[PDB]
């Protein structure tokens with residue numbers, strides 16, 4: 001975990017540069033140093049207490065630019081630093097961290113929907129391609145459990161997907177897993193205990209409030225309680241054994257709603273509001289700044 005839930009970037013009217021941190025302990029939000037470049041459809045992750053913002057797209061009134069950028073935020077300094085860029089731009093990207101390396105998964109570059117996957121090594125400041133997924137996936141949910149990487153749902157250029165697959169690093173190989181019971185593009189995907197959770201998303205017709213989880217031992221998906229708000233392009237993270245979902249789009253409003261899931265009571269509750277409604281944020285947890 002760490003201490004704060006950091007939300008970076010996102011979309012409302014145009015791509016956003018906001019970096020804001022929420023403190024579950026007191027309900028407070030802090031506005032921190034803006035991203036150097038606005039971006040929506042990015043992912044966040046943490047390695048060695050540093051926050052990384054990965055990929056996305058700058059949707060601006062002066063043009064639209066898919067991002068291959070990797071940028072690093074140090075809470076100690078309140079400063080963003082550029083890292084090596086990825087091989088390709090990846091809007092609507094998913095990311096997972098294994099053994100202190102960042103896996104960038106899928107995403108789009110204009111009409112190109114990637115199946116490619118690449119791995120960042122912070123000691124080297126270097127990206128390297130690994131085996132591609134079996135499926136092109138943008139708006140892909142990514143989680144890590146037991147040092148295996150999961151790519152869940154998304155959009156292949158033609159169809160939104162219920163499919164999911166797993167990457168075995170020591171084999172450099174992807175294999176399909178049991179598909180979800182729901183087609184989901186732009187779901188929030190995370191791990192809690194022995195399960196991969198997929199919350200919300202878009203099925204090609206409707207934004208979803210439903211939530212399902214994959215037990216790696218049983219290889220089956222089970223629905224849990226739905227969120228209070230239907231949402232796609234949400235941010236998701238885990239903080240002290242609870243899932244937090246941030247923002248997204250319900251087909252009417254860019255949501256400021258933050259919901260929290262308690263696995264013991266199988267209930268969602270409203271915990272806070274983001275300072276403004278937005279979709280396509282990057283979210284991760286690390287220590288409080290300065």
Ligand SMILES: O=C(O)CCc1ccc(Cl)cc1
Pocket residue numbers: 040041042092138139140154155160185186187202232233234279280281
């Ligand atoms: O299925 C689609 O068209 C993609 C929907 C989508 C939009 C934004 C994000 Cl961040 C993810 C997915």
